Amino acid sequence: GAASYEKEKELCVKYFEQWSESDQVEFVEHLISQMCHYQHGHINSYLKPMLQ
Amino acid sequence: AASYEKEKELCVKYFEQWSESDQVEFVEHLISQMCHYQHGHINSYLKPMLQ
Numbered sequence A: 001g002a003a004s005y006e007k008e009k010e011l012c013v014k015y016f017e018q019w020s021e022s023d024q025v026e027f028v029e030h031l032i033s034q035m036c037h038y039q040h041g042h043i044n045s046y047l048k049p050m051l052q
Numbered sequence B: 001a002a003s004y005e006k007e008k009e010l011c012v013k014y015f016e017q018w019s020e021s022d023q024v025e026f027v028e029h030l031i032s033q034m035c036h037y038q039h040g041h042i043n044s045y046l047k048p049m050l051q
Helices: A002-016 A021-033 A037-051 B003-015 B020-032 B038-049
Strands: none
Touching: A002 B003, A021 B003, A021 B020, A021 B038, A037 B020, A037 B038, B003 B038
16 A cells, blocks of 8 residues: 555654664664665764764 | 553554655654653663674
8 A cells, every 4th residue: 555655654753752762772673674875874974964 | 551551552554654764754853852761761672683
């Protein structure tokens, strides 16, 4: 249901917003573990400016 | 969990069917909503995984 992806994404964001700071972290790291090298590159390049 | 574990599992399932670029846009969104401290954990997890 690819026309439903925006709505899926909004629900997941909603669920995520109700979790504790550490479940949130555990979740993002799990997602990261399932992604490929190129995905890892574009999140790193997004995270890096934001650490300062 | 268990509420988090029920919901995390649903989220993971939705995620696995998104395109590689919707996956990235999504994670990037999650991160934009996080602590400087959460960011430090993510960075620490991600940096060894690069090389």
